[PDB]
Structure 1
Amino acid sequence: DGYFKIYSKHTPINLVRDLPQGFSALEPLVDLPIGINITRFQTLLAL
């Protein structure tokens, strides 16, 4: 509806090469009144 939102969690893990089987919910974080057409996104890792 023209508003962009973020939710997050951080947690400690000990698994070598795959996403850990378990359950935990994410809290909300931000709201951003951008009002723009988004159809794609792109991640910035550092080199």
Structure 2
Amino acid sequence: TPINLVRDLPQGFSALEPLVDLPIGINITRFQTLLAL
């Protein structure tokens, strides 16, 4: 997005374009972001 705005999220619109679908399946949960230091 062109997101610079001022604060919080704006009133706009746009959509995500898929890239790939890998065959893990196997009962996914507990997504965990990877924070840096």
Q: TM-score range by the shorter chain?
A: 0.5 to 0.7
Question: What secondary structure sits across from 2:32 in the alignment?
Answer: strand
Overall identity of the aligned pairs, in %? 100
- Between the two proteins, the alignment pairs up a number of residues equal to 37
TM-score by length of 2: 0.67
Cα displacement (A) at 1:25: 1.1
Q: Which has the higher strand share?
A: 1
Give ranges in structure 2 of 5+ residues lacking alignment: none
Cα displacement (A) at 1:31: 0.7
Cα displacement (A) at 1:45: 1.9
Cα displacement (A) at 1:17: 2.8
TM-score by length of 1: 0.59
Which residue of structure 2 aligns with residue 39 of structure 1? 29
Q: Moved runs in structure 1, 4+ residues, more than 3 A? A: none
Give ranges in structure 1 of 5+ residues lacking alignment: 1-10
